[PDB]
Symmetry: C2
Subunit: 133 residues, 2 copies
């Protein structure tokens, strides 16, 4: 979201250059891992290490600006809280992830909400399978 600066200020928070760089990286990268972010941020702040990237992501997530989702091997990837609202389908071979509108699981989630009293988004974890493509 591009209103992040006013929202944080209205809450007493400001992002230092390096924190903004990490936020930009998560924005720019799409499905970025902490290490991908490290690489991207170094193009501006070469002196940054991964522990700083780990903490900034923890902070940004807690602040509501960033969110994570798991992909292959259950590895978490970061994206802005407002983007990537859907289901990822991980292929059992092709290095490609297919994104699918979560409505495409409207009944399923409902079936779960009843038979188990379990409410799910279908977003946090990916779904592994085989793809004809």
């Amino acid at each position: 979201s591009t209103d992040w600066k006013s929202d944080l200020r209205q809450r007493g928070y400001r992002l230092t250059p390096q924190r903004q760089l990490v936020l930009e990286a998560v924005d720019t990268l799409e499905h970025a891992t902490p290490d991908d972010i490290l690489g991207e941020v170094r193009k501006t702040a070469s002196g940054i290490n991964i522990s700083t990237v780990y903490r900034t992501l923890e902070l940004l997530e807690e602040l509501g600006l960033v969110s994570h989702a798991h992909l292959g091997h259950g590895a978490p990837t970061y994206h802005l809280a407002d983007r990537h609202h859907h289901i990822h389908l991980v292929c059992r071979d092709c290095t490609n992830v297919i994104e699918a509108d979560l409505s495409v699981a409207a009944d399923f989630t409902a079936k779960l909400r009843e038979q188990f009293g379990f409410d799910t988004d279908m977003k946090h974890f990916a779904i592994f399978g085989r793809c004809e493509s």
Copy 2:
């Protein structure tokens, strides 16, 4: 499966004590992590380290005796290839995983097989959500 010994021999393979210990641990533990396995195996072979546990699991999985599935945070847990054929539902708070017959997703998987040409088991990765319990 309790026929593992004859099947491996009929393929030219035998498990040393420590390899059998790890196989027993995966059997005994239910949703065990490499570290849980390490702990369990040490009760018989105290001198074993985790790297040995990592390789034995890799081997056993490749051999077909063991299989893994992801739970909370996308962490892989090991079980015997023949067991745990179902869907895990990870609660957004309670330290409990609910197992659900995968038929309880018969339509959903089908819906995916068509609209995306994606064939999925629903087993490999867990489903995160909220549980009334």
